[PDB]
From a paper:
Baculovirus Autographa californica multiple nucleopolyhedrovirus (AcMNPV) has been widely used as a bioinsecticide and a protein expression vector. The DNA genome, along with the baculovirus basic DNA-binding protein P6.9 protein, is encapsulated by an enveloped, rod-shaped nucleocapsid; the major capsid protein VP39 and some additional minor proteins are known to comprise the nucleocapsid. Here, we show a 3.2 Å resolution structure of helical cylindrical body of the AcMNPV nucleocapsid, composed of VP39, as well as 4.3 Å resolution structures of both the head and the base of the nucleocapsid composed of over 100 protein subunits. Surprisingly, the C14 symmetric base had nearly identical features to that of the apical head, except for that in the central regions. Both the head and base could be further segmented into three parts: an outer shell, an inner layer and a central region.
At both ends of the nucleocapsid, the VP39 cylinder is constricted by an outer shell ring composed of proteins AC104, AC142 and AC109. Along the helical cylinder at the base (or head), three AC104 (VP80) subunits bind to the outer surface of VP39 at the end of the helical cylinder. AC109 sits adjacent to AC104-3 on the end of the VP39 helical cylinder and sterically blocks the elongation of the cylinder. AC109 appears to alter the conformation of the Thr163-Glu176 loop, elongating the “spine helix” in P-domain of VP39s at the terminal layer of the cylinder at both ends. This results in the formation of a disulfide bond between Cys169 of VP39 and Cys187 of AC109. Additionally, AC142 extensively interacts with a neighboring AC109 through a number of hydrogen bonds and salt bridges. These interactions result in fourteen AC109-AC142 hetero-dimers forming a “barrel-hoop” like structure, which tightens and constricts the capsid cylinder from 500 Å to ~400 Å in diameter. The inner layer of both the head and base is composed of AC101 and AC144 arranged with C14 symmetry. Interestingly, residues Leu243-His334 from each AC101, which is comprised of four helices and connecting loops, form a ring-like structure that encircles both AC144s in the inner layer. AC98 (38 K) is only found in the base as no discernable density corresponding to it can be found in the head. The N-terminal domain of AC98 interacts with VP39 and AC144, while also associating with genomic dsDNA. The interactions between AC101-2 and AC109 essentially bind the inner layer to the outer shell at both ends of the capsid.
Residue numbers in the entry:
A (entry chain B), C (entry chain A): 490 to 664, 673 to 685
B (entry chain W), D (entry chain X), E (entry chain Z), F (entry chain Y): 14 to 253, 279 to 309
Write the structure that this text describes.
């Protein structure tokens, strides 16, 4: 059920931070990623394989854990509004990022020619998003696994998620066979 | 055929001095606004206007939109347009207008105690029982008749929760966005209808499409009500021979400041 | 370089098969999951969590590697239309999986109440499709790293990815506090 | 009485096929622009219009301003309004337009190599010395006599504080917002004058008072010239019976998005 | 006013015996088909028909489509509508019709060897140089003046690469869906044009929306050319008083098998 | 000459305000259908039409066939044409339409409890005994009069076990064909007759010949009532000038969705 995904995401945040990712928390999500604020992170990550990163993102599923949260009864409208503003902010941020990959590619290439610059930018975006989610989770009070949902938040999430998925799908791009032979040997 | 301005039913129920009716003729249209343009500009710094939405197939569709009347040097109180129940009596100098206007405002903000006080204070005047009581009943009934339609609850709710006009994407640096839409719902139904019909979303969401009319918001919702001040910056300009001759009419692009705030989502089902 | 993606997808598939997933690959892509083929898989999976799974599928990213294999010059038209047909087939299979998720959930949970039911179903879908993809890769002949784009193939892939991702998006959901205590204490 | 458009002298220097002169009558006005509105909308994505600056004393002062001619889905070169020196030939594919158009564009960008190549290749054609030589001389002379006046006035502006036009993007963080101030300054005097008269600043400072018109930028300067890409967000929309019956003249408020970029400074003496 | 059928210019190149021309006036319509339906039905088991596409706002759009004429028990050779260049000579018994029809088929099939053989055989016959030389010259000129227009290439390719029609989206455990579309790319320009105009896509993709006009495939491209065979099952039936009286006209919904095969998508810019 | 629709006897038995009976002129015909076309399309997503079946001996024969009225984007409940007794009351909002319609449906689905509730609630109304009771008798009696013709049992069974219309040949992925066929047997005689005449067979067996008309099915039957879902694919499109000019009436073959389901076997003695 939902509690499984919630706890899994919490533990994933904790463990991924413990292994490699570290708080550069001076920067929030309100604006684009700041290469000047990530030179050290880029240099660190340049010495690893990032090819498992992919251009898509499960924004709807990613924010689904935060969906199930409330105290007993509707004490105030603060929770739902806070979440709505968060959702619209996230949608705008992702769309602007997707629209402006050329600017970031140029900016991060200026710091040096690195092969995995695309995956670097993608992970920068995701890490900023994760830190902002970490803070907003620090804001909230309590969650329950009763899985009582809200229709309006659900619809807003679905629509903005469709926009985000289409925006990332806009990604198109233009322009060692011994490894193919090795694969064919391995399968056979 | 019938005027639809809330203040159109204003009556100077002194039994001696008659009341005026300065409402503009257009108030009789079925726009949905419950205020005549003259009342709109007098009681608030607002001016009705329309924005058209075209297409590639030459289709017509349009919505209402408001306009500022506040200048630049005006600060603080003068910058409040539609205050909340907390700060309206102070900003509207209730001891200045007709008692009927005072009752109207107390009703607008659900100020029942002020209603009862004004009623039982008027009761003491001589000659009230003749016609002043019937006039006060007529005014109260007219106000309630205007109010009930806009309310979502009503008697038989004709609710259609299809327009997702959430009213807040401002990128407010402070992570306190949870106040804009937090308000605008604790208000009177008339206030909510007026603000909905007054300000048009900068970002439009229909089905799968996304539209942008203004790159950045213009007004903002705050605890003291709607305020016509773009956040984090000086206010926008408000203007209230040979070179001109050679510069003939060239689509002057009027410089007055409209209203722009919030996001609109529309499902396929809604009309 | 796209060849990074080539080798990355190849090695990810190879290692993912090596670790736990044993090839049960006789069935083709023209069909929906069959319980008889996956009962033991579900039973063994029950004890291993799969919440890592993302509901969405990177259709275009998944199918991009096999876009770029072609001997120089127009060696044969067969590869082009074969790839196009495979793309359409996978698209329709994904569409039908998304459309009829409830029936498959019921047909697979009839054998036992698990907490990863839909998770396991999506894993089965992805695993069977990936086995079919590995067989199709075993079908192909040779590749090149020259990275020549094809407008026709790319346009087809983009449109199909848009449709498929939207259909996946339409998937929705029916509308222990010490965990959050630990999370907040970690955050502070 | 005399037209002042560079394209107004466009002529097919073949002596056989007639040439077109679509320049509108307004191109005879010495208002400061140097393009006929027809050529402005044809070659560029611009449409002349004027904005009046009033005050509280009802005084008239108007300034030139331009308008978008791009939709939403157009990308790449289509988003460029005025290309830079390096990226003008590709966006204009000069090989497809008339040779006189190519010569005029080369003169505008001061592409001396292209002008010399066109001239010495035109030396080869037969009948050139008869009339095509004199036609090319007339075209070149007119182009020089239009360009020349601009360079002093642009130069003098680039000398002293009289009107400090800063193309610095507001809200410095913003987006790319490149300080292409010298890329503009790398434009020819005609291009610099055209862009100055086309786009107006968002903040204006007269004497000591401060005036603001837009809360955010509209266009942006890039290495590919002036591109109408709103910073930090999707581009704005460009539009290019019963309910309509009840909607009368209600201050239509044109929805097309005009140019707004940069910062201006006004000294007391300017008029 | 002028017929636009390839077979409409059939000429008996003997200068003695007259020739026939049974083309109906339908060939004068510029619908995209270049064969009078008489010749199409006579040579091929097809018939012109158009299926119009509607919308929600009452907008009209129509697209061409073919119709089967083969029977049920008819199997094999007769089942083929458009045979391939490999298997067209045998199925159409070129030794049966006039040599002009054979020339037309060979030019359509780009059988240059047959054209050269027919020309050099016609050289020998007595009286050929009198009139038959120029007769065959004009016939060949007309044939090529059609063929080039049919092909996308011509002197310069006037191709509208906007509508993407695949023609083979089927999946019935063929295991070689990639083989089903091997042809349609070896066909001549006119052959490809005619086959595309004849068969309509069961699935249509306009940008973001998906539409469907059939449940399952109708025909299929075979190595021996186009065949009026429905895959995955027995062939559908082909038809070639009281109850009728008591059941008046109720939209008969004609049952003759139409054409449905392949997949289509439209780009963003296409209109 | 006499009306033969179930909804023909629909009445608003208030003794003050009359009712509506917009049953189409075909309502009087003995077409075998027992619902007038207007009420059939309004209450159900069905459209009566005629399916002509010919032969090689030029023999005319037409069989009952319905047509879809549902779009594509509609999902779940809306795709369900004739719901079952367990899933019709929820989808048919009985408390919305007039009581007589509700009772009609209750009889249709054997909902005696709702008939008793309708009667006992109707007893409470004033003026009930005046004419309300007589009209409830009239409506109920006429409805039962239609029902008996529809129902096969009746008093004397006029059933001819000749048409083996089993209402499934689908080759479905799941081995539940014996279950889909197992359904349709819980439906009343009206429901079974209506579903029989609505859907035309795709496979028909008379004597020894095997008839086939569609390569694949059209709808499917579930316990939740008659639902329209093409097996294993997208939903078929529903529609609900120069090219038109150049394309004349060419056997348009309109693509409105016809129904198809079931395997038909006809004995030699059957007529």
């Amino acid at each position: 059920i939902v509690n499984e995904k919630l706890q899994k995401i919490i533990v994933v945040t904790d463990g991924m931070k413990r292994l490699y990712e570290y708080c550069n928390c001076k920067n929030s999500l309100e604006t684009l990623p700041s290469a000047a604020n990530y030179g050290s992170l880029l240099k660190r990550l340049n010495l690893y394989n990032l090819d498992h990163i992919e251009m898509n993102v499960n924004f709807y599923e990613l924010l689904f854990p935060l969906t199930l949260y409330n105290d007993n009864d509707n004490s105030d409208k603060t929770l739902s509004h806070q979440l709505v503003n968060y959702i619209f902010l996230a949608s705008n941020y992702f769309q602007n990022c997707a629209k402006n990959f050329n600017y970031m590619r140029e900016t991060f290439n200026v710091f040096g020619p690195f092969k995995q610059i695309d995956f670097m930018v993608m992970f920068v975006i995701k890490f900023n998003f994760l830190c902002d989610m970490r803070n907003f989770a620090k804001l909230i009070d309590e969650l329950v696994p009763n899985k009582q949902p809200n229709m309006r938040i659900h619809s807003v999430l679905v629509m903005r998620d469709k926009i985000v998925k289409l925006a990332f799908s806009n990604l198109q791009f233009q322009t060692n066979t011994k490894h193919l032979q090795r694969l064919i040997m391995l399968m056979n | 055929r019938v005027n639809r301005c809330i203040f159109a039913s204003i009556v100077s129920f002194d039994a001696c001095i008659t009341y005026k009716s300065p409402c503009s003729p257009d108030a009789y249209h079925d726009d949905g606004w419950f205020i005549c343009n003259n009342h709109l500009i007098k009681r608030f710094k607002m001016s009705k206007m329309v924005l058209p939405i075209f297409d590639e197939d030459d289709n017509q569709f349009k919505m209402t939109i408001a306009r500022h009347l506040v200048g630049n040097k005006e600060r603080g109180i003068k910058r409040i347009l539609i205050p909340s129940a907390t700060n309206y009596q102070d900003v509207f100098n209730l001891n200045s207008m007709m008692q009927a206007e005072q009752l109207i405002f107390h009703l607008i903000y659900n100020n029942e105690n002020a209603v009862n006080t004004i009623c039982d204070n008027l009761k003491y005047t001589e000659g009230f029982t003749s016609n002043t009581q019937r006039v006060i009943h007529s005014v109260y009934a007219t106000t309630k008749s205007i109010l009930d339609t806009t309310n979502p609850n009503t008697f038989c709710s004709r609710v259609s929760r299809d327009e997702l006009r959430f009213f807040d994407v401002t990128n407010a640096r402070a992570l306190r966005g949870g106040a804009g839409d937090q308000l605008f719902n604790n208000y009177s139904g008339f206030l909510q209808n007026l603000i909905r019909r007054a300000v048009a979303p900068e970002y439009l969401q229909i089905d799968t499409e996304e539209l942008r009319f203004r790159n950045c918001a213009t007004c903002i919702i705050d605890e003291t009500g709607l305020v016509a001040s773009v956040p984090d910056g000086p206010e926008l300009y408000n203007p209230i021979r040979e070179l001109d001759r050679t510069l003939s009419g060239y689509e002057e692009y009027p410089t007055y400041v409209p209203l722009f705030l919030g996001y609109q989502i529309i499902n396929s089902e809604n009309n």
